[PDB]
Amino acid sequence: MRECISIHVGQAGVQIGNACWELYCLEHGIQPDGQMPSDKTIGGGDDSFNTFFSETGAGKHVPRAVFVDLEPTVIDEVRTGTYRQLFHPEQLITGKEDAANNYARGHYTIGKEIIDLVLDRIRKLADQCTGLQGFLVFHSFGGGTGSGFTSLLMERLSVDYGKKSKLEFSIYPAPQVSTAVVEPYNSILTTHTTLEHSDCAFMVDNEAIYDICRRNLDIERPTYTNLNRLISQIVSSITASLRFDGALNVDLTEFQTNLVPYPRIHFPLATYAPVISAEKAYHEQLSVAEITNACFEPANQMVKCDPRHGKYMACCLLYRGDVVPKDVNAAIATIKTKRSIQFVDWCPTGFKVGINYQPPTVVPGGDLAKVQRAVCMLSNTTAIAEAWARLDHKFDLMYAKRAFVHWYVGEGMEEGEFSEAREDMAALEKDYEEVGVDSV
Amino acid sequence: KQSSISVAVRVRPFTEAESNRLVKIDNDDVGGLRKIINVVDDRMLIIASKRFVFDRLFDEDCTQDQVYRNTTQPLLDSVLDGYNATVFAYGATGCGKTHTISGTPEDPGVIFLTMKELYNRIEELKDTKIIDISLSYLEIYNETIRDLLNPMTQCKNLVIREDANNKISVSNLSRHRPNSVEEVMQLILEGNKNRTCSPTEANATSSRSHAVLQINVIQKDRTGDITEEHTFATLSIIDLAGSERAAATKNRGARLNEGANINKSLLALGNCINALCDPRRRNHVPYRDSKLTRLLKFSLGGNCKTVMIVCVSPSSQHYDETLNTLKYADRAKEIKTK
Amino acid sequence: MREIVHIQAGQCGNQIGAKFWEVISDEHGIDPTGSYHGDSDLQLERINVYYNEATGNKYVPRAILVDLEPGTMDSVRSGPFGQIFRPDNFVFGQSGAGNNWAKGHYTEGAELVDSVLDVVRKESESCDCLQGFQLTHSLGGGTGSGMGTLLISKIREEYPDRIMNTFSVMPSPKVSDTVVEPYNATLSVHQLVENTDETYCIDNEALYDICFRTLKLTTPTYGDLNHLVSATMSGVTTCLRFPGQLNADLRKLAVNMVPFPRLHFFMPGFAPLTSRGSQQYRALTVPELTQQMFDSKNMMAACDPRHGRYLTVAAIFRGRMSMKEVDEQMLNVQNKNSSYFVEWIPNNVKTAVCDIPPRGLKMSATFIGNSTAIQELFKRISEQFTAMFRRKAFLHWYTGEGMDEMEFTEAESNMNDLVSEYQQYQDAT
Ligand SMILES: CC(=O)O[C@H]1C(=O)[C@@]2(C)[C@H]([C@H](OC(=O)c3ccccc3)[C@]3(O)C[C@H](OC(=O)[C@H](O)[C@@H](NC(=O)c4ccccc4)c4ccccc4)C(C)=C1C3(C)C)[C@]1(OC(C)=O)CO[C@@H]1C[C@@H]2O
Ligand SMILES: Nc1nc2c(ncn2[C@@H]2O[C@H](COP(=O)(O)OP(=O)(O)OP(=O)(O)O)[C@@H](O)[C@H]2O)c(=O)[nH]1
Ligand SMILES: Nc1nc2c(ncn2[C@@H]2O[C@H](COP(=O)(O)OP(=O)(O)O)[C@@H](O)[C@H]2O)c(=O)[nH]1
Numbered sequence A: 001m002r003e004c005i006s007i008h009v010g011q012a013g014v015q016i017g018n019a020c021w022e023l024y025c026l027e028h029g030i031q032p033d034g035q036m037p038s039d040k041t042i043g044g045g046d047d048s049f050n051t052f053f054s055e056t057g058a059g060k061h062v063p064r065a066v067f068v069d070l071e072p073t074v075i076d077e078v079r080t081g082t083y084r085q086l087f088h089p090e091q092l093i094t095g096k097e098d099a100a101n102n103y104a105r106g107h108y109t110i111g112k113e114i115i116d117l118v119l120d121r122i123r124k125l126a127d128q129c130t131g132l133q134g135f136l137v138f139h140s141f142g143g144g145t146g147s148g149f150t151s152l153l154m155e156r157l158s159v160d161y162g163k164k165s166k167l168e169f170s171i172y173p174a175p176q177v178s179t180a181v182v183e184p185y186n187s188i189l190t191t192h193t194t195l196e197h198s199d200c201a202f203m204v205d206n207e208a209i210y211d212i213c214r215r216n217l218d219i220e221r222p223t224y225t226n227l228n229r230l231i232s233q234i235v236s237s238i239t240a241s242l243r244f245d246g247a248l249n250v251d252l253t254e255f256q257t258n259l260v261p262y263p264r265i266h267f268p269l270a271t272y273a274p275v276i277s278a279e280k281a282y283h284e285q286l287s288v289a290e291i292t293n294a295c296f297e298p299a300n301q302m303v304k305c306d307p308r309h310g311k312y313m314a315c316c317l318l319y320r321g322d323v324v325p326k327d328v329n330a331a332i333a334t335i336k337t338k339r340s341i342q343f344v345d346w347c348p349t350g351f352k353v354g355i356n357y358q359p360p361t362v363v364p365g366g367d368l369a370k371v372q373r374a375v376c377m378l379s380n381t382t383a384i385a386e387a388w389a390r391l392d393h394k395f396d397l398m399y400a401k402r403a404f405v406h407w408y409v410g411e412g413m414e415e416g417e418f419s420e421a422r423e424d425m426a427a428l429e430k431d432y433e434e435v436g437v438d439s440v
Numbered sequence B: 001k002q003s004s005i006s007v008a009v010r011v012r013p014f015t016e017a018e019s020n021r022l023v024k025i026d027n028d029d030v031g032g033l034r035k036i037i038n039v040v041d042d043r044m045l046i047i048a049s050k051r052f053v054f055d056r057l058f059d060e061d062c063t064q065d066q067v068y069r070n071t072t073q074p075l076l077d078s079v080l081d082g083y084n085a086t087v088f089a090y091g092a093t094g095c096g097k098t099h100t101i102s103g104t105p106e107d108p109g110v111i112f113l114t115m116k117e118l119y120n121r122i123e124e125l126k127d128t129k130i131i132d133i134s135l136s137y138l139e140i141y142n143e144t145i146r147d148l149l150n151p152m153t154q155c156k157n158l159v160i161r162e163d164a165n166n167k168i169s170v171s172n173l174s175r176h177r178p179n180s181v182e183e184v185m186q187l188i189l190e191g192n193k194n195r196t197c198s199p200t201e202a203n204a205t206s207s208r209s210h211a212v213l214q215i216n217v218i219q220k221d222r223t224g225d226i227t228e229e230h231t232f233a234t235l236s237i238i239d240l241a242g243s244e245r246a247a248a249t250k251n252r253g254a255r256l257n258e259g260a261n262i263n264k265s266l267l268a269l270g271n272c273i274n275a276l277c278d279p280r281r282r283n284h285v286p287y288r289d290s291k292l293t294r295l296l297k298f299s300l301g302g303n304c305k306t307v308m309i310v311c312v313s314p315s316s317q318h319y320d321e322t323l324n325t326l327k328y329a330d331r332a333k334e335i336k337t338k
Numbered sequence C: 001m002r003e004i005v006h007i008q009a010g011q012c013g014n015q016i017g018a019k020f021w022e023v024i025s026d027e028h029g030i031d032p033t034g035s036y037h038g039d040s041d042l043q044l045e046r047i048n049v050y051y052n053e054a055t056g057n058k059y060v061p062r063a064i065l066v067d068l069e070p071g072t073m074d075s076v077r078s079g080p081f082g083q084i085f086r087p088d089n090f091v092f093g094q095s096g097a098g099n100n101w102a103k104g105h106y107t108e109g110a111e112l113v114d115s116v117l118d119v120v121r122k123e124s125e126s127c128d129c130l131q132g133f134q135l136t137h138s139l140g141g142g143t144g145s146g147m148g149t150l151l152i153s154k155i156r157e158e159y160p161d162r163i164m165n166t167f168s169v170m171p172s173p174k175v176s177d178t179v180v181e182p183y184n185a186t187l188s189v190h191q192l193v194e195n196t197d198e199t200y201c202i203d204n205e206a207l208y209d210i211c212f213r214t215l216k217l218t219t220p221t222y223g224d225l226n227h228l229v230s231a232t233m234s235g236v237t238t239c240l241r242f243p244g245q246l247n248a249d250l251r252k253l254a255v256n257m258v259p260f261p262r263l264h265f266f267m268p269g270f271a272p273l274t275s276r277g278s279q280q281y282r283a284l285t286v287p288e289l290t291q292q293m294f295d296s297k298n299m300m301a302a303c304d305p306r307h308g309r310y311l312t313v314a315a316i317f318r319g320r321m322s323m324k325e326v327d328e329q330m331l332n333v334q335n336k337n338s339s340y341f342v343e344w345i346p347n348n349v350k351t352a353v354c355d356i357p358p359r360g361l362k363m364s365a366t367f368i369g370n371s372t373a374i375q376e377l378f379k380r381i382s383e384q385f386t387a388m389f390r391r392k393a394f395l396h397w398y399t400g401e402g403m404d405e406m407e408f409t410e411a412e413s414n415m416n417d418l419v420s421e422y423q424q425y426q427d428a429t
């Protein structure tokens, strides 16, 4: 089997998980209360849901999820919502104050009093697992919980499992837009966990998806529901090969093998091509070449950085629906013909292709349009360093005067650790600059 | 210009047992005796994987006599001249802070030599001046002052009042007038007995409060006639509790907040020192952020010599602590140069 | 979980607290008798933040009423919501402070502080997880300032690591009705600067200006001022009680808004304030909510933010709204008025959003500024202080109760240190 364990930490992670499990239940025809009427109606016995769901004797399907937060508002929302009857009652909360947006509180002071429960539940889930593939961790750099507790949890997981894959889906802070004052500190502090423990971290920011919603979907006032639905679509596209048959499947292990060129360079961008409203669903062919070209536009990138200011070092294109390999080869040849898309000389192969026969699913009441073809592009490129640099500058502007540092050092953090994380980020930026130079 | 805050950082010598049990790995490869904290110059230390610049670097062979003669002898001259003087001590656990500041009877520490030379100096100056010495010893704990030499005093008695003539004069503080260094050390031991402490990790006697020793020297004319000119001075010897991370802590509770306060106090002190060294920030210095900085409001300016004895170790068991200590030392004078 | 203890001291504090409990009870659908008559399950979900259960379905607010004369207690007990409170929580002496800080702090209040602390301990021990305390008083008065600051000191000694909030009503330069306001205000600020984590400065002059001009009220009374302060108080702690999209408890606001341990004096505000006649001639949208929010004349602190720079800002919206609009508007405000924001903080705005707007309003917002301009307020008080201290105008009344001149000098020096610290960051750098 091909199981994957999903973990959601903090408000952003939990709400993204709400969207993700909504999409998954819609995909596999599982009702909110856990029963699947298709098996009773037809008979079933040949479906594929072990990647995310686990059966019981009564026919209920329980997801392989762990919802974690340091305050109970969001998880109490889930406990009394539409999907209250779906999850196991082990949706773990701290019956106390949250991290309150600082790494030190989430990592050292109050995050150590729930980590035992989280690890015990992860162990129990893994014991039911026979073919475990990896961990999909959802969190946010900006928040205290999503940074500190995620760091602690990933450290413990690396100590315990070690050999298993770990994939991150994080909400990086945007260049201009921001909803907190101490975001740079937490984001820089998460550098160590992102580097040493994570195997491949996919980064997102709210500003880029807001721009995508404004331009493509024709949504003038977008809320977090739309962002979560888009991120859920991307995550479903990533894991589609573990659930359905396709011409060229792509599991997580080979995925990382052909995406990650060096151990420290595991920070790819992600994008989804056919983001189009139902009004614009007509007047467009949406052929394979069209969507593949749409993947590489700077505007459609889900991280506010310019790909044209850096050399592509690897690319993986995961197609869903009615797609023929010859069309994909023609599209990739067309992309290689273009001059603006610069590839590093030491990666002549360039692209990886996977194809799946399951078309994308549409959530009812969602604002995405039904399409026959879709493609998700994950690209390892040097552009992301620019994003790090801008956040780097923000950190300096707040650390010269030691602003807000007393809150952090009052919760078990040492003053010297800030500079250490800063130097680690600087080393990472230097490595990303170094790999981009042409060989001699 | 010349400034008044000087940084002298010393490297602890290896013990016989640690050297024997840790040099085996170095001998085999060429155990953690890598000599991580080495020296290349009296004012520069690039052997930490990074380059740091310090006012004075005190090597392995440096014994107590040259330590005193280099770090704190001019402070006695300044305090006898009529200007305040201060010496801080900072070092994590196992860094030899106690060995340097106090020492053993075989090897006298900094306090012994400083008191001995002060007593000799006043003995020489007796022929022309009448000089007396007043001693006080107090502890700062959770932003509360406690009299170590006179316990049972309520915390609300000991408060700071800003005297009009640039004096602090913490109220209800017991005062002593020892006449010799021996009884000074007896009083110091009496105070250290009352020092707040608690077992932590495998250590049983980890100090968890800042300690301050104040020596007020009052001088007046003997062989002359004058109306009112004494200009009494103060020498401060400050022992700062080492920083600590909750991660090491497990019991939490009162040990947490205590430790947290210590960190906050250290941070405040650092800012004050930095605010004093940078000429741009001279408009305002955050003295009020902690009890210690308020207590030393007039004992860090340009008209008073301040020094800091930073004690580190070369072992690998304390690599992170030593790096943190070096970074804290660099905070005083962030002369980022190569 | 995350339950708050409310304390009231003095006439002004007791009146504001009575209005605050009326507003909160209306928000949660609580009858004056203490029973529940709501129309939504969400109200009951997190009612334990402010209330305690009682056997016959009743709900008792977790309030503690303190005074030194029984007149205000009798007035509150006979009010519309008098029966809601616990009779045991009423604590009061017999000899008033008489607008004397020394009597409130040293002579009279020292007797009643033990009973008040015992009641506070009884209330706090039964709590599940204590978020923190919330005092309401005025610094210009007698028993209010003195006994308030005494209680803050005692509770900080007993509960060092819990968030402390004080909704202080500062004295005004124009609207002054007590001759010895500078002494009381200085002596109370000397304690508040040390023993608090937040301090929402409120001034009667600003509230009167808002009532006259923004609301077009012809004859304001203290009820309307208490109404505005109650709206602010309810808005600040909304994220604890109701679900939202960006939750923000008291500690999160404290962490985001306070850069240094002493700069924790804030200017509050409530955005949708309009007259009844002019309601139909305007929409209700996020951009105009923001425009009224950052309007210099809508602040309750009687300080012009244009004469300073915003060290930090916090905006707590309530209602169904898009996050893109909120973020875009806050970014536009920061970029358009870059002269009024400090350069050395990349983002000066902490945003929170709650999904439940207050009763008959489509959506509302609350503002918590932290700007250098507040120093001017202290400067004003400091001026009056020295104007009365060089000659010792009324000093004998204070020294008769056991005070000393050194305490006055210490308080003045501390206030000057605070003003200088605030002025340090106002200069361009
Ligand atoms: C039909 C209609 O629109 O009625 C409104 C109303 O006319 C206006 C003018 C209301 C009205 O407010 C005032 O005129 C007012 C007067 C003095 C002091 C403060 C307010 C209203 O009184 C206020 C009242 O507001 C509420 O109900 C809120 O929930 C408020 N609670 C209370 O006012 C309240 C007080 C005591 C007992 C029970 C409820 C609240 C505000 C913030 C946080 C929590 C609760 C409402 C609906 C109205 C009237 C009645 C006319 C406004 O309400 C507020 C609180 O800002 C003033 O500007 C808004 C805009 C509204 O349009
Ligand atoms: N994409 C997306 N991002 C979100 C969502 N909710 C919150 N965020 C992001 O979360 C970031 C801040 O994290 P927090 O709101 O503090 O949530 P948290 O990580 O749990 O941190 P704490 O609440 O303090 O525990 C913001 O910058 C938001 O951009 C969401 O629903 N979708
Ligand atoms: N907002 C408001 N302020 C008040 C009220 N009553 C008094 N004040 C203010 O409080 C100050 C007097 O303080 P006071 O209540 O007498 O203090 P106390 O005697 O110690 O309780 C005056 O400057 C008034 O502006 C009230 O009902 N509402």
Ligand SMILES: [Mg+2]
Residues within 6 Å of the ligand: A010, A011, A071, A098, A145, C247
């Ligand atoms: Mg949260």
